[PDB]
Amino acid sequence: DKTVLDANLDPLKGKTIGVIGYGNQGRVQATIMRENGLNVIVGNVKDKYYELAKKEGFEVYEIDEAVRRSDVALLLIPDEVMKEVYEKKIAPVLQGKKEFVLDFASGYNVAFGLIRPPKSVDTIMVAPRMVGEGIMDLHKQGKGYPVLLGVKQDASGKAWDYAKAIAKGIGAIPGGIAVISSFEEEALLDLMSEHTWVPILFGAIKACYDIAVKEYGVSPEAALLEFYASGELAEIARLIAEEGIFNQMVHHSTTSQYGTLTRMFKYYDVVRRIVENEAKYIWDGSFAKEWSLEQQAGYPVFYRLWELATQSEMAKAEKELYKLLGRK
Amino acid sequence: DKTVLDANLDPLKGKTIGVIGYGNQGRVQATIMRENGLNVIVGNVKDKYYELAKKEGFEVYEIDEAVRRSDVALLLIPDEVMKEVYEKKIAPVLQGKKEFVLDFASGYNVAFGLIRPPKSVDTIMVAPRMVGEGIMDLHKQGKGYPVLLGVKQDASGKAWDYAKAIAKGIGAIPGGIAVISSFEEEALLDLMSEHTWVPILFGAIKACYDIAVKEYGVSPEAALLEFYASGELAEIARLIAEEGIFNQMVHHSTTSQYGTLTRMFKYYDVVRRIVENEAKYIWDGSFAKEWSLEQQAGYPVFYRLWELATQSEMAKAEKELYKLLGRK
Amino acid sequence: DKTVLDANLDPLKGKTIGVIGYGNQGRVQATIMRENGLNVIVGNVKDKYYELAKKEGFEVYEIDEAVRRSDVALLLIPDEVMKEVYEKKIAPVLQGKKEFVLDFASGYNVAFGLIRPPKSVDTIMVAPRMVGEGIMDLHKQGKGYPVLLGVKQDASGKAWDYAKAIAKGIGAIPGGIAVISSFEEEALLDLMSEHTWVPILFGAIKACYDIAVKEYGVSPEAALLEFYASGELAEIARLIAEEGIFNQMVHHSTTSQYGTLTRMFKYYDVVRRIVENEAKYIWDGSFAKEWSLEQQAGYPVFYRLWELATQSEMAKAEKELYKLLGRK
Amino acid sequence: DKTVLDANLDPLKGKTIGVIGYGNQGRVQATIMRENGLNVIVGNVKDKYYELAKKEGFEVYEIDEAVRRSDVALLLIPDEVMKEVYEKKIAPVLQGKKEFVLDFASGYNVAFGLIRPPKSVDTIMVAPRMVGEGIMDLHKQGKGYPVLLGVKQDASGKAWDYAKAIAKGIGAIPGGIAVISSFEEEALLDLMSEHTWVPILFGAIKACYDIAVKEYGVSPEAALLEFYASGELAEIARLIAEEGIFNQMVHHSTTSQYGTLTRMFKYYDVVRRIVENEAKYIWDGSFAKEWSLEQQAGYPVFYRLWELATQSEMAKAEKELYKLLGRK
Ligand SMILES: [Mg+2]
Ligand SMILES: [Mg+2]
Ligand SMILES: [Mg+2]
Ligand SMILES: [Mg+2]
């Protein structure tokens, strides 16, 4: 449809490639890049990660050095450490370079205007789709892992070609798919995930535990063993990624199927309203504001909630148990 | 009533006059001041505006220089660039000068405590009442344009005299009126305007367009030509400023009058509640907090909303059309 | 799209042209017509307007005479004086003429069945888009002013050609656009305008004034000078018609932009509901009934509301002030 | 306060006095006028009332004749027969006379714009305050009966003098009071009375009867004898007009006082809301529209409701009873 199965590595050999960051994503993607027959330069703060950088025989310049000698760059560092790096070591160096390309791994800091490069350069995006560490093995196998991509600013016109060449140069394709889209969409999706069906799930589990062991005289042990302390969910998720979310259910018992489907169609509207609210709250921009402020203030709420969770009942029972199984 | 038609230029000749800013308001008011037989000194950042400053043969000192050699000063720069200037180049220099006068063009940054000068000096206000560029021509004609004024701090007692002398020295009077009031009132009014009947109007127009071209099969063209792409509203606003808001309507058709009046008296209560809410939200101070934070965060929401607007349907249709008419 | 930029003056020379009315619209459009090299006949009541008619050297027949000698006619008189003229001096004369064309300036009296000509004739529409007097100058310049047009009844088939020829013969094009549409749409639009965002605006202004000068101790003077007694709105409306509703805002201060956009997106749903209600109320036909009855009864409500408005506080304060400025 | 106890009969002798109408109010007030040493002319339709007119030795001209020979006139005919008389026999004759005075007995037909005389004349009001027949006897005694008065249009300036002279010429003063007010107020008051506490009272009585004789097994006879078939209410109303609404209650039993006061203060808010609604509905003008339409339609609802009332149970029982007492 709006997909590409494979493409050319046409321009990105004859130029240098800047990789800013050597952590979860930077180190890995750079490993793959070097594997793809490319010229490694890696600008990074001379901290622990620097060891890490040069513990794989790379050219670890400092950030300014890298971009100066680079014709293209990647910002694979996280979203919150940025806006300081950019202003300090980058924003200045931009004005000299003019045929420079800037790519990201997430449209967050750019889809909300937190970063506004000059017109001189081209602005694109490319996104992996899993835990970071999870890509290592899937490439070790050598099977395609998919990505997204989008463009914000095309002064040259080679933008799309650049995007596809990079997608290939990281090996996401062949084997996987590459979808054309925008930044807005990417960020929207990541945040809808992190905001809608994860926390709901967790809260529902928590409530089930509370109810059982507060109003029906159950011991924590059975509650935990049922809800999550068993590896059921893992097999479920796996079967989903292989056969299909629904068809998967064929491998369960009927009773389960009936109750599940009924209750699902019975509650759709509620979660629908919820998701509408949250997606709107995002599309506007409120959440980015909220989070930037929480960073500027000292991460208080973060702390309090981590504490409440780790100091609730379920967590202590889980500690006892996981200890009993030897699980760390 | 509480008005003055004309007053004396008594003290403000024998002193120097500091004008901080040379933009929309500073450049203009300083033009008029020099026209009034006065001594021009203009402290400004040595940026583009500096050219602008000295492209009219003024004494462009730097800010500190100006205030040092000034006995009175004006802050005609915007509201958001301030609180940095004040702390850096001003707050220090205050402690030396003691008979110094400080005047503003808006009570925003002072009515909410964002600025608290020392007791040594006198604190006043004086406010024009239009687009800035709009005052240029109305003076080119030489007809009075009105203003406000208020006082916050009077250590001498000459405050009011100073205010009136300045009002005259900028030419707002003769010909216009000068109202005594406070800062609170001025800011409250500006913000009620910017928050209540402008955005409501825009949203209503937008909704009318959406409804028509989504549920009655109209083409954007007619919708736009009716609602705003015609210069009707301009003639309306003009007739208002000349005859009176209501009496104006005499020049319309009856049908229009009937429907308008009916619907107006039919919906008063709703907008009343709304305006109450917003005015309270302001009187408290919440909005200033909100906005200062949005500045500290990176203007995200600003950006997203500019995008949504400029990337909605109505805007694209309007672009097509205005192109068709040759309008920029 | 569904637009025409210019067209032919093909049939409308070789026939006579009936203009019923010589007021805001009739006199003007007839001026332009005579300017376009055409044969002027003007049926009008022998009242003041008759002087007016023949104070421009026209052939002022009486209505019946005009239509008798006309092959085509225009009803540029208002909407409420009609339904008496039609029945008395027109409906009879129709039955003789058979290749007769009938055009209007508004679909009100025909979109609601208040007028139902015989099948013998062709029924069309053509609509200017401003105050009437406002077209005079825009033609004096000679730049296209746009219109609408639609058809109700085509016995010949030349209808569209007739419509376009007339549009050209009044000079709306070249320079402007001409949109094909129906009557329903035209009337719907005019009334949505006159019912939704005008009265809302007025009521909001009124409420702001009331609130300020009743609960925060402001004097009427400043309230008025802020809200409307300044020509701000005029410059706003003008910039809209030139650059675009939104892009316009660039010439304002940020703060204004932020507050405006926020509050706009915050209240959209309310005005949406309102506009839905009113548009439905119209689409049905209720409003036409209401208004025709109010005419049959003696225009009471009209009177009472004119009084309330002209005898409210804001109006008296405005009178004092506008007197103070010399404004009539 | 805003009252006058007695005044001069200064201008109104040396002019003729037009009395349009010879019914409840016209015949009576004209009787008093002739008694006051004045020149009787009475324009009236040559119907039964004409006999009536000239059965008291008056100069019964026809309407046009009267006004032609009159310098001042009174419209003491009802409110619904008017707007036909005015247009037919009056509106024309106005344009000749220029120092003419026009007075009314109710601001209804003028406070709602149903009548708009030319600027040439003076427009005033004067209002009796009881049943019409009730004034006959109170003058037969010769004790002052009060009135209102107001002005709408004063081209001369003698208006107020004219009003007071007339008030005296009808004998309302001396002995009574004359209050200055407007038309709006007069009409508003009459209608609030006719709309708020009369119908409420009637409906409450009706409901009490229904409840008793439907849910507690009472016979109509006792219900009627208690509620209204006894002359209690008459003595109550009389004592009110003499001592005072409240002080009156002293002549009752305590129990009654206690229950009455309690329940009164217990229900104030409800009737308050009601009265607000109705007074607004009037102040606007809606009711006049409603009523004029009901007249234009054929008085249907009037008829149906008269029937329902006269054909309800309470009415039949009352007929039986009043027959039993011989009361007509
Ligand atoms: Mg993520
Ligand atoms: Mg402002
Ligand atoms: Mg119209
Ligand atoms: Mg009455």
CB B203 within 8 A of CB C267: yes
| Cβ neighbours of A201 (radius 10 Å) | 12
Q: Of A125, A20, A166, nearest to A82 (Cα)?
A: A20
Closest by alpha carbon to B259, among C133, C281, C87, A176?
A: C281
Q: Is C80 on the interface with B (CB under 8 A)?
A: yes
* Residue B7 near residue B164, CB atoms below 8 Å: yes
Relative to the alpha carbon of A78, which ligand is closest? 1
Single out the residue of B204, B272, B260 nearest to residue C271, CA to CA: B204
C235 touching B (Cβ < 8 Å): yes
Are the C-beta atoms of B83 and B114 separated by less than 8 Å?
yes
Number of domains in chain D: 2
How many residues are listed for chain A in this entry? 328
* C108, closest residue in chain B (CA to CA): B255
Same domain, C177 and C218: no
How many angstroms separate the CA atoms of B10 and B159, rounded?
12
Please name the member of B189, B198, B309 whose beta carbon is closest to the beta carbon of C246. B309
Kindly report the CA angle at B55 between B50 and B58, in degrees rounded to 5? 80
Tokens for D105?
Answer: 């007995």
The answer to whether the Cβ–Cβ distance between A286 and B301 falls below 8 Å is yes
Q: Residues C69, C177: one domain?
A: yes
Asked if B209 and B326 sit in the same domain, the reply is yes
C37 and C177 fall within a common domain: yes
Test D114 with C296 for CB contact under 8 angstroms. no
Q: Which residues in chain A are contacts of B304 at CB distance < 8 A?
A: 112-113, 283-285
Q: Phi first, then psi: what are they for D123, rounded to 5°?
A: -125, 120
Task: Establish if A293 touches chain B: CB-CB under 8 angstroms.
Answer: yes
Report the alpha-carbon distance of residue C151 to residue C144 in Å, rounded.
22
- Cα(C109)–Cα(C86) distance, integer angstroms: 11
Q: How far apart are CA B279 and CA B292, in angstroms?
A: 18
Instruction: Report how far residue B275's alpha carbon sits from residue A176's, in angstroms, rounded to the nearest whole number.
Output: 55
User: Is-contact B107 B150, C-beta < 8 A?
Assistant: yes
Give me ligand 3 centre to Cα C150, in Å.
17
B28 Cβ neighbours under 8 A, 6+ residues apart = B132, B133, B135, B136
Q: For the packed helices D220-227 and D313-324, what is the interaxial angle rounded to 10 degrees? A: 80
With 0-12 / 13-18 / 19 or more C-beta atoms within 10 angstroms meaning exposed / middle / buried, residue B164 is: buried
Residues B226 and C197: their CA atoms lie apart, in Å, by 12
Q: Which domain holds residue C138?
A: 1-181
| C297 at D interface, C-beta within 8 A | yes
C-alpha span between C48 and C34 (Å, rounded): 21
H-state helical runs in D216-231: 220-227
Q: Which of B179, B192, B256 sits opposite C194 (nearest CB)?
A: B256
The answer to whether the CB of C58 falls within 8 A of the CB of C21 is: no
Q: Are residues A131 and A163 in the same domain?
A: yes
Q: Which ligand is nearest to the CA of A187?
A: 1
The answer to whether residues D128 and D105 touch, using CB atoms and an 8 Å cutoff, is yes
Cα A314 to chain centroid, rounded: 28
CA-wise closest residue to B70 among B9, B19, B125: B19
Q: Do D130 and D211 fall within a single domain?
A: no
Residues D34 and D157 in one domain: yes
Are C23 and B253 in contact, with CB atoms under 8 Å apart? no
Residue A226's contacts (CB-CB under 8 Å, 6 or more residues apart) are none
Q: Which residue is listed with tokens 């997608």?
A: A167
The reply to whether B311 touches chain A by the CB within 8 Å rule is: no
The sign of the CA dihedral D249, D253, D258, D263 is negative
Chain A: give the shortest CA distance to residue B310, in Å. 14
Domain end marker among D141, D157, D181: D181
- CA separation for the pair C205, B191 (Å, rounded): 13
Residue B192 and residue B109 in one domain: no
Partner residue opposite C199 with nearest CB, options B80, B260, B314? B260
From D127, D161, D181, the end of a domain falls on D181
Q: Are B31 and B55 in contact (CB under 8 A)?
A: no
Q: Does C311 touch chain D (CB under 8 A)?
A: no
Cβ contacts of C300 on chain D, cutoff 8 Å: 112-114, 285, 288-289, 292
Q: CA dist A184 to A160, A190, A191, Å?
A: 17, 10, 11
Same domain, D200 and D143: no
Last residue of a domain, one of C146, C181, C216: C181
- Same domain as A160, residue A201: no
What b/e readout covers B243-262, taking b as 16+ CB neighbours within 10 angstroms?
bbbbbbbeeebbbbbbbbbb
Residues of B in contact with A283 (CB under 8 A): 304, 308
Q: Locate the chain D residue with the closest alpha carbon to C308.
A: D284
The amino acid sitting at B302 is F
Are A and D close enough to touch, i.e. 3+ CB pairs under 8 angstroms? no
Beta strands in chain B (DSSP E): 3-4, 17-20, 40-43, 72-75, 101-104, 122-127, 147-153, 178-180
Q: Measured in angstroms, how far is the CA atom of residue A88 from the centroid of ligand 1?
A: 25
C111 alpha carbon, distance to own chain's centre: 16
Indicate if A262 and A170 belong to the same structural domain: no
Residue C171 gets the label, from left (phi > 0), alpha (psi -120 to 50) or beta, of: left
Q: Give me the total of CB pairs closer than 8 Å, taking one residue from chain C and one from chain D.
A: 39
How far is C249 from C237, CA to CA, in rounded Å? 11
Q: Which one, of A327, A37, A312, lies nearest residue A168 by Cα?
A: A37
Find residue B42's DSSP bridge partners. B19
Nearest to A296 among B296, B300, B304 (CB): B296
HSE (side-chain half, CA atoms, 13 Å) at A228: 13
Mutate which of D109, D290, D292 to test chain C, going by most C C-beta atoms within 10 A? Answer: D292
Lookup: tokens for B76 = 């005609």
Please give the Cα distance from D255 to D110 (Å, whole number): 48
DSSP for A99-138, written as a single string:
S-EEEES-SHHHHTSS----TTSEEEEEE--S-SHHHHHH
Tokens of D130: 């009881």
Residue with tokens 């009176």: B244
The token pair at B213 is 């071209």
Say what the resolution is, in angstroms. 2.8
Same domain, D312 and D279: yes
Question: Regarding beta strands D147-153 and D122-127, do their DSSP bridges make them parallel or antiparallel, or are they unpaired?
Answer: antiparallel
Q: How far apart are CA A200 and CA A208, in angstroms?
A: 12
Residues of C in contact with B148 (CB under 8 A): 222, 225
Experimental determination technique? cryo-EM
Is the CB of A289 inside 8 Å of chain B's CB atoms? yes
Residue (of D80, D198, D190) closest to D129 by Cα position: D190
Pairwise CB contact (< 8 Å): C234 & B229: no
CATH code of the domain containing D173: 3.40.50.720
Q: Residue D107 Cα, ligand 4 centroid: separation in angstroms?
A: 11
